[PDB]
Paper text:
The non-structural protein 1 (NS1) is secreted from the infected cell and is thought to be associated with disease severity besides its proven usefulness for differential diagnoses. NS1 can be found intracellularly, where it is essential for virus replication, docked on lipid rafts of the cell surface membrane, and abundantly secreted into the bloodstream of infected individuals during the febrile phase. NS1 is comprised of three distinct domains, an N-terminal hydrophobic β-roll dimerization domain (residues 1–29) formed by the intertwining of two protomers, an α/β-wing domain (residues 38–151) that extends out from the central β-ladder domain (residues 181–352) giving the dimer a distinct crossed shape. Here, we present high-resolution cryoEM structures of ZIKV recombinant secreted NS1 (rsNS1) and its complexes with three human monoclonal antibodies (AA12, EB9, GB5), as well as evidence for ZIKV infection-derived secreted NS1 (isNS1) binding to High Density Lipoprotein (HDL).
Numbering used by the authors:
A (entry chain C), B (entry chain B), C (entry chain D), D (entry chain E): 1 to 352
Write the structure that this text describes.
C-alpha cells in the first residue's frame, strides 16, 4: 500500500509504503452489493434448513441484515420458480443483536433450475405462503430464538471494492463463535492505538499507562473479537474490560480504565452509542465514600425532561464515564444520583 | 489524520482517517539530523558518570551511535571550555549491540556556563586530553564491557516537514530493559501483520495459521520488545520464537513457525540481515529422519566458494529457512548437510 | 500550495510547492455543502420573483438543489411568520435541468427576522398556499419553463470547512450563460489533461494527437463552460464536441475524438454516466460501410434482458464509445445493430 | 495519482487524486539531470552534421547546454577512435538564445562502441582535432548563427531517480518551432493560474478581468509555447503579449495586461528576471498625456548610481511594471523619465 498522511497536531506530510487503517464508522462507508455466494446455493441452503426446522435467522451485524433485505425478493422468486413453497421476510434490527444456536447447512447439490439470478438486484414479486423463513424482525412469537441461526456467513473477497464496492460471502462449514477477521484492523503507533471493524471504532491512549480514550459504536454485536487482532492479550482479567467480552470487546489492556469495571448493564439497547469520558451537560460529579454501589446505568434527564444536578461515585476517577446517544446523556454504573428518587430515573433495560 | 492509499493488488484508492504505519527501514541512512536536549546538560551528565566509574557507552541502536558521532565535536568543546579533561571517541557499531550494567546519571544542575556552545554545534574547535570516555568502538581492552552504560536515552518529539527531522532526546529517569516505545508501529489488517521500528520490519500472514512470512533486520539490538506494541502475546513459549527474545523479537504467536525452534546461533554477526523462507540458491533440501541435530548455522558456500548442493533435516517443513546477508546465503540451524566434513563448514559466531 | 504526491506511472515521491487539482467527483467523503449567505435576502428575492411572475426556479446543479432542499423549511417558516403566502416546495432531480429565461433579481431590501425563526430550519416547512415557489421537480405543467428562473447564484466566498467546505452564495447581478468558475479546475501535465467541476470529470490523453479518454457525470447541467478555464479553445467546430455545448461541454480540441461527433441523442436521461471507450461483455463491432445511419443510442440488451451481439459502425474507430449508465451499457450514435427489429431496441429520447 | 496538500493560503489541508504541478524555477529545485537516452548514437549525428557543414550548435534551453557539456567527453573520447577528426567545445549560454535555421541530420546507423571509449567521460577529452564542432559560447566569429543547429532533440522518456530523474532524449526527424511539450504544465484552479516548464514560471490571476501577475525567467528561450497547453487561446492579438511570443510567451489573455503592449526591448540581456508590478524602490510615476513615446527600458539608477525620481506615462496603469534583475529594477516601455538627459540613461538591446 503506497499512500500518505497529513498530521493535524503538526503539519508534516509524507507518502510511502506501509499499512493504512481507515475509520469506516463515521465515514459511513458507501453503497454495497453483498453477493451471498450463488443465490441458488443460498436458496437450497434455506430450503434444507427449513426441512430441518430452522425457523429464522438473527443477523450478527448490520451488513448481513442489509444483504438479506437486498436479496429478499429475488430469493423469494427463485423459490417460487422452483418446486418450493417458502417465503423469506426481513425486518428491523433490534439491539443488541442476540445469539443463536443454529447454523445454515451447506447444500450438497444446487437446485435444479436456471441460474439467471446471479447478482439478482431485487425487483421481482412472488406468491405468499403460510410457512415463512423470518429473518430478524419482530417475529419473536412466530419463530423462537431457539431455532434461529446465527453467524453462518464468511467474507471471502472484496472484488471491485473501489467503484463496484461488493463484498462477496459464502456459507461457512465449521462452527465458530468468532467475529469476521477479514474486516478487522488494529494499529498502534507511539502513544495512540485503535481497534476497529465495520461498526466499532475504539481508541486508546497512554497516560502513565495504556487506557481507554473514546469509543464509537453504531451497533451492539455479540460475537467474540479474535485474539490475533488485539494488542497485549496476556495477564488481563475479564472483570476490568469496559466493553464486556459478550459484546465483542477486545481482550486487551487497552480496553480498560482505572476505577471502572465491566460495563455489562449499560444502555446497550440504543442504536448509536458514543463513549466519552466527560461530565454530562449541566451536571456535576464528585467522589464520595458514602455513595451507593454499582447498578444499572441511569439517564441524566427524567421523563419530563428535568435535569439532575448532583451525582456521586465511590472510587471512579474524573472525568466520569458517560454514554452519549440520540436519547440524551447517560452515566456509568459507578455513578449514581446524589439525592433523587428512583421513580424518575430511567434505568437501562437489562441485557442478558 | 487524513492520508492517501492505493493498493496495487486491487487498484483500490481510498481516503479516510485513522492510523497510518510506514516502513522506515530503507531510510536508515539520513532519517534524522538533531542533537540531544541541551548538550550542555549532556556534558554535565557525561562528566558525572566519569566521576562515578562509567568508562564507556555501548550503543543500543544505530540512531544512538549516529547521534554520538554527530555531537562529538560540540560536546568535546563544552568539555574543553570549563576545565573538563575528557575525550569522547566514537567508533563503529559491532553487531550484535550488547548490554551495559550501568546507567547514565541525571545531573542535578548544568555546568556553570557554556553559552559559547550556543550556535556552534557542527563546526567547533577544541583539543584533546588523556581521559577517554569511549563510545562503543574497538576498545574492549581499554573499558571492559561490565563498566559501560547502555539504554539510557528516551525520545520526546520527532518528525517535521523536512528531509532531516529533529529528534529531541532526553536522559532516562529510571532503570529499564525495553526498547523505545515512541518509535514502534504495529498493525494488522485482514491477513497481513507488520511489527516494526526504525531498524526492524517483521512480516506475518495467515495460511491456515498465523506464521512468520519475512523479516528485514538492519541491526541486532538486545533490548526487549514492549508487550503493549505486540499482537496476541498469550500462551506462547519462548523456545519457539524464530527471532530470540534476547535479540528484541516480539513475544507473540506471529513470531514463530511450525517445525522451527528459536534461532540462537544464526548469523547474528552480519551488518545487514534478511530472513527468508525459500531454498538457498543452487542447493536442495530433503526431509529425512537420519540427518543431523540442532546446532550453529552454516553458510551455503565453502571458504573457496564451493557450492554445497545437498542438505537434509529431520522434521522441518518446506520451504526451508535461510538468512540472507552481505556475505551470502546462510541456512537455518535445523538444516544440515548430508555429506560434508564439519571442517569445511563455516560456523556462525554466537555471543551470549 | 504546499503539498506533494506519488506518481503511480513511475512510482515516485516528491514534496514541494505548486498547483494541485483533485478529482472531486469520485470522492469517498463529501467536502462541499452549498448554503445561502443571507436567507433573509434570499427570501425577499424569492417573494419579489414570485410577484413579477416566477412560479419556480429550476436548479442548475445538484448541489444547489440540495441547498434548496435544506433551506426549504426555514424559508417557509420565516415567510409564514411575516405572513407571506409563498410556499417553497422542492421536487426530485430530472436530467438534464433545462435553462429558464428569467433570472432571480437582486432584492432591494432584506426580509425581517422573526423571534422564533432563530434556529428554526429543516423541519418547519409550511402548508401549501396560493403562492408556491416550486423548485425543480417533474411538474412543469404547474410551472412552465418560460416562467422559471435559472442560474441566479454566485460563489460569494469559500467558507472554511474542516469536514465540509461551506460555500455561501448571493443572488447574481449579471445575466450570464456561464457556469460557476469558483469550482472549476483545468490542467495539463505533459500529455495528461483534466477538465473538472463539482459534477464533471473529463479526462484526456495523447496518442498521436489530443483525444478524449474518459469522463464521468453525476448530473446534467445546461450552463456554458467558460473559455478562461479551457485549454486550446480556438479553432474548434461545435459540431464535433462530443458532449454538446448545450450541456456545458468545454469548447476545445481536448473535448473531441476522431470518427465521432456531437452526441446529442445519447442516454442523457441517466442519473449517472461513465463515458468509456471500449466494448463491454457480450458484444462485437465490425467496421462496415453498409451499416445504418446516425440515430439515438440503443442499449445492448432488450426489454426482456436479451443481448444483441452483432454490431456495425459506419466510420468509427475501435474501441467504440459506450456509456455505462445505471441500467447497463449503451452504444454511441455511430453504432447500430447489424440485424435486429427496431421494436426490441430501447431508444433514448432526445433531450432538447 | 494521489497527493499531499497543506495549503497555507486558506489553511485547508486536503487530499485526493488528480494532477499536481510543482514549481521548479523560483525554488531553483532543478532536480533533473539531463542526459541523452542514446549517448552512443550521437557520434554518428555529429559526424554527419560536420560532413554537411554545420559549424556549431546553439542550445535552446540551459538544460540542453548542461547535457552537452556533460557529454562533451563522452563524444570526444570516441570521436578520436573512429577515424573522425571532430572535437566538440561547449561554452556558456548567452541570453537570449537565438533561433537557428537548421537541425541535426537524422542518424544513418549505430556507430560501433569502442572498447576503450567505453567508460570515458568529461574527465578525458580529445587532442585538438583540426575541426572543432563548437557548442554555444561567444564563438560567433568562429561559427555564426547562420549555420547553427537549434532545437533538434526531444525528451525521449523519464528515467527513474530518487533525487534527480535522468531526462532522456532523442533526435527529432521533423522541423517544428515548438517548446518541449513533455516538460510543460498548465493549470487553473478557481482564480489561480500558472504556465510552467523547466525554466519559466508565469503567474496570472483575476481582478475584474484576467491579467498577468508575475513571472520568473531563469533563461530567455526563443521557442514558441504550444497552444495545446495554453488557457484561453482564442481572440488574442500578438501585439498585446507582455512577454513577446518570440521569447516563448504563452498565447493567451493571461499573458497580457491592460495599458501595456509587447515588451520587445526589455532587459533581455540579463541573466535572470522577476517581472513584477510595483513601483521601483523609492520612485514615483505620474499619469500625464504629454509624456514621451514608447522606447527601450531605462534602469532607475544612472551609470554612477544616481536615482531618477519623476517618471511619466500617458495611458498608464498602476502599480507600474518593473523587471527586477540582479543589477536592479528597470521600467517598462511606456514608463519614461519626465526630465533627464538621454546620455545618462541605460538602454537595452533587441536580439532580433
Ligand atoms: C496526561 O498526560 C500528560 C502528559 O502527557 C499529563 O500532564 C496529564 O496530567 C495527564 N492527564 C491528563 C488528564 O491530561
Ligand atoms: C498456503 O501455503 C501453501 C503452501 O505454501 C500454498 O500452496 C497455498 O496457496 C497458500 N495459501 C492458502 C490460502 O492456503
Amino acid at each position: 500500500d503506497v499512500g500518505c498522511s497529513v498530521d493535524f497536531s503538526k503539519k508534516e506530510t509524507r507518502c510511502g509504503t506501509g499499512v493504512f487503517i481507515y475509520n469506516d464508522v463515521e465515514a459511513w462507508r458507501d453503497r454495497y452489493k453483498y453477493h451471498p455466494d450463488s443465490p441458488r446455493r443460498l436458496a437450497a441452503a434455506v430450503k434444507q434448513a427449513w426441512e430441518e426446522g430452522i425457523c429464522g435467522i438473527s443477523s450478527v451485524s448490520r451488513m448481513e441484515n442489509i444483504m438479506w433485505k437486498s436479496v429478499e425478493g429475488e430469493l423469494n422468486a427463485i423459490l417460487e420458480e422452483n418446486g418450493v413453497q417458502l417465503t423469506v421476510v426481513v425486518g428491523s434490527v433490534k439491539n443488541p443483536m442476540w445469539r443463536g444456536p443454529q447454523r445454515l447447512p451447506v447444500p450438497v447439490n444446487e437446485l435444479p433450475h436456471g441460474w439467471k439470478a446471479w447478482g439478482k438486484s431485487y425487483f421481482v414479486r412472488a406468491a405468499k405462503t403460510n410457512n415463512s423463513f423470518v429473518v430478524d424482525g419482530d417475529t419473536l412469537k412466530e419463530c423462537p430464538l431457539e431455532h434461529r441461526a446465527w453467524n453462518s456467513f464468511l467474507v471471502e473477497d472484496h472484488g471491485f471494492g473501489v467503484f463496484h464496492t461488493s463484498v462477496w460471502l459464502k456459507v461457512r462449514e465449521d462452527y465458530s463463535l468468532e467475529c469476521d477477521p477479514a474486516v478487522i484492523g488494529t494499529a498502534v503507533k507511539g502513544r495512540e492505538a485503535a481497534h476497529s471493524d465495520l461498526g466499532y471504532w475504539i481508541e486508546s491512549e497512554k497516560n502513565d499507562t495504556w487506557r481507554l480514550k473514546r469509543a464509537h459504536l453504531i451497533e451492539m454485536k455479540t460475537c467474540e473479537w479474535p485474539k490475533s487482532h488485539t494488542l497485549w492479550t496476556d495477564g488481563v482479567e475479564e472483570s476490568d474490560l469496559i466493553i464486556p467480552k459478550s459484546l465483542a470487546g477486545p481482550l486487551s489492556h487497552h480496553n480498560t480504565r482505572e476505577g471502572y469495571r465491566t460495563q455489562v448493564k449499560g444502555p446497550w439497547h440504543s442504536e448509536e452509542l458514543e463513549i466519552r469520558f466527560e461530565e454530562c451537560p449541566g451536571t456535576k460529579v464528585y467522589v464520595e465514600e458514602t455513595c451507593g454501589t454499582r447498578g444499572p446505568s441511569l439517564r441524566s434527564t427524567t421523563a419530563s425532561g428535568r435535569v439532575i444536578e448532583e451525582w456521586c461515585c465511590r472510587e471512579c476517577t474524573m472525568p466520569p464515564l458517560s454514554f452519549r446517544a440520540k436519547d440524551g446523556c447517560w452515566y456509568g454504573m459507578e455513578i449514581r444520583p446524589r439525592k433523587e428518587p428512583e421513580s424518575n430515573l430511567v434505568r437501562s433495560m437489562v441485557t442478558a
